[PDB]
Amino acid sequence: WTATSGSCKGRCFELQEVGPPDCRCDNLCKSYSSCCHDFDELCLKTARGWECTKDRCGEVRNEENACHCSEDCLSRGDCCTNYQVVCKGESHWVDDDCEEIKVPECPAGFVRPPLIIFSVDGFRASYMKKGSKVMPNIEKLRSCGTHAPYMRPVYPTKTFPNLYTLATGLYPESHGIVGNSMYDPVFDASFHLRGREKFNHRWWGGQPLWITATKQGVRAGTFFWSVSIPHERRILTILQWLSLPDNERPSVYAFYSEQPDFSGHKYGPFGPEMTNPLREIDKTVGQLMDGLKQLRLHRCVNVIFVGDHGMEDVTCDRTEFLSNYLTNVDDITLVPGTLGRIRAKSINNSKYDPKTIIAALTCKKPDQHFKPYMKQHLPKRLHYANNRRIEDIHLLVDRRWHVARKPLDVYKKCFFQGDHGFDNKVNSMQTVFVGYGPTFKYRTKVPPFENIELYNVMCDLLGLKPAPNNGTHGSLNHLLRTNTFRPTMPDEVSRPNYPGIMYLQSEFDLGCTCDDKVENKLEELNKRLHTKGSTKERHLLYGRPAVLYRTSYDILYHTDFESGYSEIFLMPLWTSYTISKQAEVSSIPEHLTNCVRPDVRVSPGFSQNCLAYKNDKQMSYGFLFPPYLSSSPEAKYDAFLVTNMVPMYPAFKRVWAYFQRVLVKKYASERNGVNVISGPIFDYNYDGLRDTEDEIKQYVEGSSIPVPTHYYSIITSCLDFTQPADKCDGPLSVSSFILPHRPDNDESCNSSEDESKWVEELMKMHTARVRDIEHLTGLDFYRKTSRSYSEILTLKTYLHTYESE
Numbered sequence: 001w002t003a004t005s006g007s008c009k010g011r012c013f014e015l016q017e018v019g020p021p022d023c024r025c026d027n028l029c030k031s032y033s034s035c036c037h038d039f040d041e042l043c044l045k046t047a048r049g050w051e052c053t054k055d056r057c058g059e060v061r062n063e064e065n066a067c068h069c070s071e072d073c074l075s076r077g078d079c080c081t082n083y084q085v086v087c088k089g090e091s092h093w094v095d096d097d098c099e100e101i102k103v104p105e106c107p108a109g110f111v112r113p114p115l116i117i118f119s120v121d122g123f124r125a126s127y128m129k130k131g132s133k134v135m136p137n138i139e140k141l142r143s144c145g146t147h148a149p150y151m152r153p154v155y156p157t158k159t160f161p162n163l164y165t166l167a168t169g170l171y172p173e174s175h176g177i178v179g180n181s182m183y184d185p186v187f188d189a190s191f192h193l194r195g196r197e198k199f200n201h202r203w204w205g206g207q208p209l210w211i212t213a214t215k216q217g218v219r220a221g222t223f224f225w226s227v228s229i230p231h232e233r234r235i236l237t238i239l240q241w242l243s244l245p246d247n248e249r250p251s252v253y254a255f256y257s258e259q260p261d262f263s264g265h266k267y268g269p270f271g272p273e274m275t276n277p278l279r280e281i282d283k284t285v286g287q288l289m290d291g292l293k294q295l296r297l298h299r300c301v302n303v304i305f306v307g308d309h310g311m312e313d314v315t316c317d318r319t320e321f322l323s324n325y326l327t328n329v330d331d332i333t334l335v336p337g338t339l340g341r342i343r344a345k346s347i348n349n350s351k352y353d354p355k356t357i358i359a360a361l362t363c364k365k366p367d368q369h370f371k372p373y374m375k376q377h378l379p380k381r382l383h384y385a386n387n388r389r390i391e392d393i394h395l396l397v398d399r400r401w402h403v404a405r406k407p408l409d410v411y412k413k414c415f416f417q418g419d420h421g422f423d424n425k426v427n428s429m430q431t432v433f434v435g436y437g438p439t440f441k442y443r444t445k446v447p448p449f450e451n452i453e454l455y456n457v458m459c460d461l462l463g464l465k466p467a468p469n470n471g472t473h474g475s476l477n478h479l480l481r482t483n484t485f486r487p488t489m490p491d492e493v494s495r496p497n498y499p500g501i502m503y504l505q506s507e508f509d510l511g512c513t514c515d516d517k518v519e520n521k522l523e524e525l526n527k528r529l530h531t532k533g534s535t536k537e538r539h540l541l542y543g544r545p546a547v548l549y550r551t552s553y554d555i556l557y558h559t560d561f562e563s564g565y566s567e568i569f570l571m572p573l574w575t576s577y578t579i580s581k582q583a584e585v586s587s588i589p590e591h592l593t594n595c596v597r598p599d600v601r602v603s604p605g606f607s608q609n610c611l612a613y614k615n616d617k618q619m620s621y622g623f624l625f626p627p628y629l630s631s632s633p634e635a636k637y638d639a640f641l642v643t644n645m646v647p648m649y650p651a652f653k654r655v656w657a658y659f660q661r662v663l664v665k666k667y668a669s670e671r672n673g674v675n676v677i678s679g680p681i682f683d684y685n686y687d688g689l690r691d692t693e694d695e696i697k698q699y700v701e702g703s704s705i706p707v708p709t710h711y712y713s714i715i716t717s718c719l720d721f722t723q724p725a726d727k728c729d730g731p732l733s734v735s736s737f738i739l740p741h742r743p744d745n746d747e748s749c750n751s752s753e754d755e756s757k758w759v760e761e762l763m764k765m766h767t768a769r770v771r772d773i774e775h776l777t778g779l780d781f782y783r784k785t786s787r788s789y790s791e792i793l794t795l796k797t798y799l800h801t802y803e804s805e
C-alpha cells in the first residue's frame with residue numbers, strides 16, 4: 001500500500017528515497033506504483049517539446065514547459081539543451097574542434113570532476129565503424145578521448161548479468177545475477193525480468209558503485225530510470241542535478257538507454273531499421289554534451305560511453321528442440337534461448353538422472369548446434385559455475401541459434417531477428433567502451449579489455465577504494481592521464497628449497513624401471529653445472545613464479561627445463577622451458593618407452609611411484625617437460641625423472657601428446673621461439689581458486705598422488721617477433737590455456753579422428769588469461785621482466801580469442 005495523496009511540489013526527482021506508504025517522487029517511483037498523485041503533472045512536463053526555437057528566446061518563464069528559453073534559465077539550471085545555440089549564437093559541442101583537456105576546468109565549488117556513465121543496451125562493437133556516418137557526437141567522443149576497438153562482456157551475455165558486472169566488477173557467479181531468469185533453491189524463489197521478485201535485495205550480491213560511493217561520502221545520482229521517463233527528461237534531470245549546490249550535488253551519475261537492443265531484437269543487428277535508433281542515441285549524446293557545455297562542465301566531467309553486450313542474427317527457425325533428443329522431456333525444466341540450463345522438474349522424482357540427460361544430448365546429430373556440459377566442465381574462462389543458482393547441466397549454444405524444450409514453446413510463449421547471451425568470446429557479442437574527459441587520455445586507442453575491469457577505474461575516477469572484486473587493479477592504468485593506482489607485486493609467501501644429491505638409487509622402491517645403465521670427465525662437470533642451474537636463464541625468462549601460500553617445495557634444475565616441485569602434491573606446481581625457432585623434435589627411443597627414473601635430489605617419501613599407476617586401471621601418466629623436445633639424447637633422460645611425471649587419463653594423453661609433440665614446435669616456429677610454463681590445476685569445488693589438500697576428491701588408486709582437474713600452459717614470446725623469445729628487449733606476447741583433465745573426449749565430437757583434426761579446436765575453446773591460472777594455482781608469474789608492473793598486469797589479463805576480424 002502507498003498513500004499516494006501527498007505532493008511532489010518542490011520534490012521532483014528527489015535523491016533520497018522515501019519509505020512506504022508515503023508517496024514517492026524519485027526516478028523509480030513509477031516502477032513501484034508509488035508516485036504521488038501529481039508526479040506526471042509536475043515532474044514529467046512535455047509542453048512545447050525539448051528544443052528552443054528562435055521565437056522562445058527571452059520568453060517569459062512559463063512553468064508548464066518541458067524546458068525553458070527564458071533569461072533566467074541558466075541560473076535556474078533548466079534551459080533546453082540547445083538554448084545557447086539557438087538564442088546566444090553558440091555552437092553545438094559536436095561542431096567544436098577537439099582540444100586536449102590537460103587539466104579539469106571546473107566551476108568553483110567542484111571538489112572533483114563528476115563522472116557520467118552513459119550505458120547503451122545491445123550496442124555491438126562494430127556499430128562504431130558501421131554506423132559512424134550517423135553518430136557524429138559518439139564519433140567525436142571516441143576519436144577525441146580514449147577508446148578500445150571493443151570491450152568483452154561476461155557470460156552469459158545477457159542484460160542483467162552484464163549491467164551488474166559493470167556495477168560491481170564481479171563475475172555473475174559471485175554477484176549472484178547469473179541470468180535474466182533464475183531459480184534460487186535456498187530461497188525457493190524465482191527471479192524474472194517482468195515482475196516484483198527482482199526488486200528484493202537478496203538477489204543482488206557484491207557492492208555496486210553507488211553503494212561504494214555512498215559509504216565513502218561521495219554522493220550518487222539515482223542510477224535507474226523508469227522505462228516511461230523519456231530520454232530527453234533523463235538528460236534534463238541529470239543537468240538539473242548538476243546545478244544543485246555543492247553540498248547536495250552528486251559526483252556520479254548514470255544514464256541508461258534501452259536502444260539499440262530493443263530494435264536489434266526485432267530487426268537484427270544490421271537491419272535497415274537500425275539506423276534510426278543509432279541516430280537517436282547520438283542525438284541524446286549531443287543533448288548531454290550541449291547541456292554540459294552550457295553549464296561550463298564540458299571540460300570538467302569524465303564521460304564513459306559503454307555497452308552491456310552486442311547482438312547476433314537469430315531467428316525462430318534456428319531452434320534446436322530437446323524433444324528431438326530426450327525421451328522424458330516432461331521431467332525437466334529448461335531455462336531456454338541462447339544458453340540452456342537444465343534441472344529436474346520435481347525434487348520428489350528419484351528417477352531423474354543427469355548422466356543420462358548429458359549422454360542423450362552428446363554429439364547426437366551431425367551438426368548439433370549446442371553442446372551439453374556439466375557446469376564444472378565449462379571453459380574456466382567463463383567463470384560460470386560457483387553459484388547454487390547455476391544449474392548443474394548447461395548447454396552452450398552455437399552463435400545464431402536457440403535451444404527450446406518443445407516446439408510448442410516457440411509458438412505458444414517469427415517475432416525476433418536478433419538475440420544475445422552466447423559465449424562472451426563471440427565477435428557479435430562484443431560491445432563498446434569510450435572514455436572522454438580530463439582524467440582520460442587524449443586521442444588514445446587501448447587494446448580490448450573485459451568489462452569486469454571497469455569498476456576499479458570508476459572507483460579511481462571518483463577517488464574511491466573499490467570493494468574486493470574480479471578486476472585486476474592497475475591493468476587499465478594505461479587508459480588514464482592521472483589518478484592511476486600504483487599496485488605492488490604480492491609478497492612471496494613460501495621460499496623454495498634447493499636440494500642437491502641426497503639419496504642413493506637403492507633407497508627408492510617405486511616399482512619403476514628404466515633402461516639407462518649406459519655410461520667421461522670432459523662432460524661430467526657439465527651435467528653438474530646444469531643441475532646447479534647453469535642454463536636457468538635460458539628456460540626461466542621472467543623469474544621464477546612466486547608461491548603465494550604456505551607450502552613445501554623444491555626448485556629443480558635441468559639442462560632443458562626448471563621446475564618448482566611440491567612435496568605436498570608430489571608433482572611440480574610449474575615447469576618452465578624455452579623452445580627456440582631452431583629446436584628439433586625427436587621421438588621417444590623404443591628402449592625408453594616405459595622408462596621412469598628416481599630423482600636422487602628428492603626423497604622416496606616425497607616421490608610418486610609407478611606401482612600406483614600399474615594398479616590404477618583408469619589412470620596413466622604423462623610428463624610436464626616433453627621428452628620429444630629434449631636438446632640431446634643425454635638430456636632426454638632428465639625428462640623421465642619421476643619428479644617430471646603427472647597423472648593423466650589415457651584419453652587426455654591424446655590431447656597432451658599432440659600439444660607437446662606437434663603444437664609447441666609449431667608455436668616456436670611461428671612466434672620465433674616460445675617460453676612454456678605448464679602445470680597441474682586442482683579445482684574440485686569449481687570456485688576458480690586453488691584447492692587446499694583437503695578438497696581433493698580423487699587420487700591415483702592406492703596412493704596419495706592427487707589427480708588434477710585441469711592442466712595449464714602459458715606460452716610467452718616477444719611481441720616483436722623479429723626478436724627470439726629468449727632475447728626480447730620489449731613488450732611480450734602471451735597465450736594460455738586451461739585444459740580440463742577428462743577421462744573421455746566426449747566434448748570433442750570428432751575425437752575418433754586424428755588429433756590434427758580436433759585437438760587444437762579443443763585447446764582454443766579452453767583459452768585462458770594468465771590471471772585465471774594465477775587464481776587456480778596461487779602462483780604469481782612475470783616477477784622479473786624489464787617491463788613496468790601495470791604493463792605486466794595488462795598482459796596477465798589478456799585473453800587470446802581465436803575469433804577472426
Ligand SMILES: *[C@@H]1O[C@H](CO)[C@@H](O[C@@H]2O[C@H](CO)[C@@H](O[C@@H]3O[C@H](CO[C@H]4O[C@H](CO)[C@@H](O)[C@H](O[C@H]5O[C@H](CO)[C@@H](O)[C@H](O)[C@@H]5O[C@H]5O[C@H](CO)[C@@H](O)[C@H](O)[C@@H]5O)[C@@H]4O)[C@@H](O)[C@H](O[C@H]4O[C@H](CO)[C@@H](O)[C@H](O)[C@@H]4O[C@H]4O[C@H](CO)[C@@H](O)[C@H](O)[C@@H]4O)[C@@H]3O)[C@H](O)[C@H]2NC(C)=O)[C@H](O)[C@H]1NC(C)=O
Nearest residue numbers: 173174175176204205206386387388468469470687688775
Ligand atoms: C571474484 O571476486 C570475489 C570478491 O572478492 C571473490 O569472492 C570472494 O571469495 C572469498 C573466498 O571464496 C569469500 O570469502 C568467504 O566469505 C564468507 C562470508 O561471506 C559473506 O560476506 C561477504 C562480505 O560482505 C559477502 O560478499 C558474501 O556475499 C556472498 O553471499 C551472499 C549470500 O550469502 C550473496 O548474495 C553474494 O552474491 C555472495 O555470494 C558469492 O560468494 C559466496 C561465498 O562467500 C558463494 O557461496 C556464492 O555462490 C557466490 O559466489 C557473504 O554474504 C566467509 O564466511 C568465508 O570464510 C570461511 O572460510 C575461511 C577460510 O579463510 C575460514 O577461515 C572460515 O572458518 C569460513 O569457514 C566456515 O564457513 C564455511 C561455509 O559455511 C564452513 O564450511 C566451515 O566449516 C566454517 O564454518 C570466506 O572468507 C568472499 O565472500 C567472496 N566474495 C564475494 C562477493 O563473492 C571471488 O573468489 C573472485 N573469483 C575469482 C575466480 O577470483
Ligand SMILES: CN(C)c1cc(C(=O)N2C[C@@H]3CN(C(=O)c4ccc5[nH]nnc5c4)C[C@H]3C2)cc(OCC2CCOCC2)n1
Nearest residue numbers: 117119121159163164166167193223224225254256258261
Ligand atoms: C538493475 N541493474 C543493475 C541495472 C538496471 C538498469 C536499468 O535501469 N534498466 C531498465 C531496463 C529494463 N530492461 C529491459 O526491459 C530489457 C532490456 C534489454 C533486454 N534484452 N533482453 N531482454 C531485455 C530486457 C533492462 C533494464 C535495465 C540500469 C543499470 O545500469 C547499471 C550501470 C552500472 C555502471 O555501468 C553502466 C550501467 N543497472
Ligand SMILES: [Ca+2]
Nearest residue numbers: 121158159261
Ligand atoms: Ca540487454
Ligand SMILES: [Ca+2]
Nearest residue numbers: 683689690691
Ligand atoms: Ca577450488
Ligand SMILES: [Cl-]
Nearest residue numbers: 158179180181
Ligand atoms: Cl538467462
Ligand code: NA
Nearest residue numbers: 613616619620
Ligand atoms: Na594405469
Ligand code: NA
Nearest residue numbers: 745746748751
Ligand atoms: Na568424442
Ligand SMILES: [Zn+2]
Nearest residue numbers: 122159261265
Ligand atoms: Zn536484449
